Amino acid sequence: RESLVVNYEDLAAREHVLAYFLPEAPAELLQIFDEAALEVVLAMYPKYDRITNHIHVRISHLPLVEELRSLRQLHLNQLIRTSGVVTSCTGVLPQLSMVKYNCNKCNFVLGPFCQSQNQEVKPGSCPECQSAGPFEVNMEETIYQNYQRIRIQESPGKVAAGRLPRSKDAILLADLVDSCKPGDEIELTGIYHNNYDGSLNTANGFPVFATVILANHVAK
Amino acid sequence: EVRDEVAEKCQKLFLDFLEEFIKYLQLAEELIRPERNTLVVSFVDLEQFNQQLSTTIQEEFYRVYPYLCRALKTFVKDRKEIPLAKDFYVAFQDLPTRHKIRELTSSRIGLLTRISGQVVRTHPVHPELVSGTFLCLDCQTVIRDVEQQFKYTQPNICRNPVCANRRRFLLDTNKSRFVDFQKV
Amino acid sequence: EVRDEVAEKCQKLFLDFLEEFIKYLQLAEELIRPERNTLVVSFVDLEQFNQQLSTTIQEEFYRVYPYLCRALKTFVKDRKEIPLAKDFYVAFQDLPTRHKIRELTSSRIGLLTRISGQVVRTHPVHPELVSGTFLCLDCQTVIRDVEQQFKYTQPNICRNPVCANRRRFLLDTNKSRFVDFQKV
Ligand SMILES: [Zn+2]
Ligand SMILES: [Zn+2]
Ligand SMILES: [Zn+2]
């Protein structure tokens, strides 16, 4: 397997500072924890360098966080936990990771570039012929990741009379893909995000931002 | 710089009103919690405290309100320790007059009105920009505190006299200022 | 990183020579003045102290000399308080052998030699670059400590993996490192 599960209760009991910093800085702390887990596992077994070069760390339990109604500006770039009902799924999609580019003037192969979730990767110039472009993706030598998108709606039983259920979007990656069927009830732990290109409304209307949740664990 | 006389007088008189006429200290005590941003003030108290101040605020609501917000911020900052990031707002309830929807005309733009209606639709909640920060793509100069009003407004001109750039900017969302938003 | 064994041994043995065989402490005492940069060391003292070290330095002068400079810098820094900006250099006088001008061949490149000649012309004095600092014109990255050797050398490649710029750079003369220069 490729994933490891960690409980927030034990993490807080053993090392309090990491638990305190966890909600308000999820991405970097998760990256550090992934590196530490990979180091420990590779110390335990040496063959994974052939099998799996990375291991994800997922948080299982947390103090339960408010429902979809309460999510506001205060929760941006934080760690949250929600419960809802799945309504649709996009299937499995191959996203880029460690992209290799072919120059179009010569045929040099530009080195791997890590694909961040916020912006697309735009290589500067070809290191040999110093051309500014254009570039295309080397399909054969690129590495790919599993990607899936989910829409979540409030459970109809918990909605107070006189108001309507509200919905939000979430994204599942790597081992989390195809872990939920539409019409099921799930609970997610994720990151409430803005910093992705295209979130700001610019063409017309007020300056309104769109929010997206990036999940890292699923509890039925 | 240039200052506004009416704004200064309104700030002073509203600080006097908040300090002298105290329910509002008790409400500022509640204002500590992160889920509270707005202070609710009864307008009949304004009428009793100073008819002149009430008339000025009614005739100059749009121009004066941001300065009353600053006065409230100073008041809560003096009474309690609150991070400077948070903002605060003022509200009024007990207007003694009503205006019909069709009675709203261009002469009333910017003043304080009260109407009646029936809700038909509500949109979801979103964050919004208030004051942005931009980076010039040519000379790498940082321009801060550009007011957005009611549209996505870029800086009018690069503050570098030699650059004079008005078309290419980047937005640093981390330094920006937000507020919640909903349409009905 | 990768280290050099011979350089480390030469540093250790030259520090031992400077600390054990003391005229050189008295000269480092003079080295405080701003008009002095070079330490003069007699080679017969090297021959007496360690024939092995003397042979290594003679056969590896070019490769070892910059590390002896660092050892001298550490010595003077330990003995006295001198700003880190200043550099220091080593000199040798009493070579027991001579070589004619025509005897200089390609096999002697990089070693320590001594010749005789007659001066014909002297050029004026100028400052020169030793280690430069450059700014990339595309991604605004700062590249420091590029060695110039004997030509105006730009950074080989921008240290940003995605940028890969090798043709457009600016030179910040303020952060740079200089040395006096004269031709004869
Ligand atoms: Zn190329
Ligand atoms: Zn500019
Ligand atoms: Zn660059």
Curated annotation (Swiss-Prot), chain A:
Segments forming a coiled coil: none
Modified residues (Phosphoserine): 155
Subcellular location: Nucleus; Chromosome
Mod. after translation: Phosphorylation by the CDC7-DBF4 complex during G1/S phase is required for the initiation of DNA replication.
Zinc finger (C4-type): 103-129
Role, per record: Acts as a component of the MCM2-7 complex (MCM complex) which is the replicative helicase essential for 'once per cell cycle' DNA replication initiation and elongation in eukaryotic cells. Core component of CDC45-MCM-GINS (CMG) helicase, the molecular machine that unwinds template DNA during replication, and around which the replisome is built.
Further facts: Early fractionation of eukaryotic MCM proteins yielded a variety of dimeric, trimeric and tetrameric complexes with unclear biological significance. Specifically a MCM467 subcomplex is shown to have in vitro helicase activity which is inhibited by the MCM2 subunit. The MCM2-7 hexamer is the proposed physiological active complex.
Subunit structure, interactors included: Component of the MCM2-7 complex. The complex forms a toroidal hexameric ring with the proposed subunit order MCM2-MCM6-MCM4-MCM7-MCM3-MCM5. Component of the CMG helicase complex, a hexameric ring of related MCM2-7 subunits stabilized by CDC45 and the tetrameric GINS complex. Interacts with DBF4. Interacts with KAT7. May interact with MCM10. Component of the replisome complex composed of at least DONSON, MCM2, MCM7, PCNA and TICRR. Forms a co-chaperone complex with DNAJC9 and histone H3.3-H4 heterodimers.
Family per similarity comment: Belongs to the MCM family.
Related illness: Deafness, autosomal dominant, 70: A form of non-syndromic sensorineural hearing loss. Sensorineural deafness results from damage to the neural receptors of the inner ear, the nerve pathways to the brain, or the area of the brain that receives sound information. DFNA70 is characterized by slowly progressive, postlingual hearing impairment.
Name listed for the protein in its UniProt record: DNA replication licensing factor MCM2
Species of origin: Homo sapiens
Gene: MCM2
Shown segment, full-protein numbering: 227 to 446 of 904
Curated annotation (Swiss-Prot), chains B, C:
Function: Acts as a component of the MCM2-7 complex (MCM complex) which is the replicative helicase essential for 'once per cell cycle' DNA replication initiation and elongation in eukaryotic cells. Core component of CDC45-MCM-GINS (CMG) helicase, the molecular machine that unwinds template DNA during replication, and around which the replisome is built.
Span within the parent record: 17 to 206 of 821
UniProt effect for mutating residue 136 to Y: Found in patients with microcephaly, developmental delay, typical facial characteristics, endocrine disorders, feeding difficulties and urogenital anomalies; uncertain significance; impairs cell proliferation and ciliogenesis
Location in or out of the cell: Nucleus; Chromosome
PTM summary: O-glycosylated (O-GlcNAcylated), in a cell cycle-dependent manner.
UniProt similarity note: Belongs to the MCM family.
Further facts: Early fractionation of eukaryotic MCM proteins yielded a variety of dimeric, trimeric and tetrameric complexes with unclear biological significance. Specifically a MCM467 subcomplex is shown to have in vitro helicase activity which is inhibited by the MCM2 subunit. The MCM2-7 hexamer is the proposed physiological active complex.
Subunit structure: Component of the MCM2-7 complex. The complex forms a toroidal hexameric ring with the proposed subunit order MCM2-MCM6-MCM4-MCM7-MCM3-MCM5. Component of the CMG helicase complex, a hexameric ring of related MCM2-7 subunits stabilized by CDC45 and the tetrameric GINS complex. May interact with MCM10. Interacts with TIPIN. Interacts with CDT1. Interacts with MCMBP. Interacts with DDI2.
Protein name as it appears in the record: DNA replication licensing factor MCM6
Organism from which the protein derives: Homo sapiens
This protein's encoding gene: MCM6
